[model samples]
Target: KETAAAKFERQHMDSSTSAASSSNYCNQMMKSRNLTKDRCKPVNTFVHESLADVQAVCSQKNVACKNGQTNCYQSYSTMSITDCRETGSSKYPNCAYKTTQANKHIIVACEGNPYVPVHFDASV
Candidate 1:
């Protein structure tokens, strides 16, 4: 079974890539990361930071998640990230995306014994 933390990594981690990526980057990455299955994911963010760097967000000061939960924490430092948005006319089996890059502080929800990030709440 895939834990939430692992699923988050699968959907969001992309440490090696830079913001100056190609226009086709999201199309390839979204597919490679398995987010284009059955239906397109409306929106997603890929963090260009080390996995340990992201995992450490779990230890940052507690904050309120968008849903009002208190298990979230905001990263102390800004990070490079790529935002992928599904095109309006995109359909299943062939997900299309628009890539936008930015530097922002991210917020995530943490859980479990090791207290790792389980959900990407937002980037600000």
Candidate 2:
């Protein structure tokens, strides 16, 4: 079974991508990355930075998480990221997405003994 860290990596790590704007990028990647499993994920983001850089963000900031969990941290540096949003035409198992690339600091939830990134919470 994949751990939350592994799942987060699969769904959101994109260090080598050019982070270019495209119509098919999200639709293709969301499916290729298996994010369209049971149903289309309404919104997700991929960070285009080195794993180490992203991991280092754990020491960056103090921010409230979704639903009041205080384990989330905000990145201090702006990172290349791609936002994948399911379109209105998106259907179960056949997801369609709109890809928007941006440079923003991302916030993520971390845990475990190693305390690496586990979930992407938001981008700012």
Candidate 3:
């Protein structure tokens, strides 16, 4: 279970993308998505809230809403929303993400340089 800080460092620092560049990517993605820029919120918070509705549905099934391990999701150099078609071509595609719900996870591809939260649901 990788911590949020570790995930942040790996994506923004350890990778080819610099922290500044990653930030820029997030900003750009937000603009493209028409989302409000709120850098004050931690990245994990963004990820968490993005799936609130998903959690609500999971709650009805008595599954504990748990945060996915950091590796559960991929980290990209920039923000980009992944479409079903783009998933295969994504630079950081097939990343691990955790969910509070059992046997389920959400994969979000943010667009642009801005970090935007996207929601995903995987339930049978």
Candidate 4:
């Protein structure tokens, strides 16, 4: 079974990325990555950094989560990432996405005893 932390890695982690320049990036990745299995994920961020480095963000600056939990943290440095946003009319099975690459501090919600990333909230 994949842990939530492990799932987070599979769905949101990207060791490195060039541009993901095409608007088709998310359309391809969200499907290839299994996010489009039953429905389209409205938004997701892929971090172009090592798992260790990304995990370290859990110990970075503390932040508030819309989940009403304080178990979130913000990245200390700007990370290379691709923000995949779904179009308004994009429907499941035909999941269309717009990929935009940027460098920004990421905010993530974490949990568990070891305290690893469980959810990607936003980028700052």
Against the hidden reference, what TM-scores do the models get?
Answer: 0.95, 0.95, 0.20, 0.91
| lDDT value, residue 89 of candidate 2 | 82
Per-residue accuracy of model 1 over 6-51 as CA lDDT, tens digit each: 9999999998885786799889889999898767888999999999
Q: Which lDDT values do the candidates have, in the order given? A: 0.91, 0.90, 0.28, 0.89
Alpha-carbon error at 34 in model 2, in Å?
0.7
Question: Model 2: per-residue lDDT, tens digit, 82-118?
Answer: 9999889878888888889999999999989798899
In candidate 3 the C-alpha lDDT for residue 68 amounts to 44
Count clashing residue pairs per candidate.
0, 0, 30, 0
Q: Which residues of candidate 1, in runs, are more than 4 Å off?
A: none
Candidate 3, 1-124: lDDT as tens digits:
9553334322322122222223234433333332323321112212222233322332232222235422123322222122111122223322222212112233432222233323232222
Model 1 scores a TM of 0.95
Show model 4 residue runs off by greater than 4 Å.
18-21
Task: State the weakest 10-residue window (summed lDDT) of model 2.
Answer: 15-24
Ranking of candidates on lDDT, top first: 1, 2, 4, 3
Q: Give the lDDT of residue 80 in candidate 3.
A: 18
Error of 1 at 28 (Å): 0.9
Task: Decide which is better by lDDT, 2 or 3.
Answer: 2
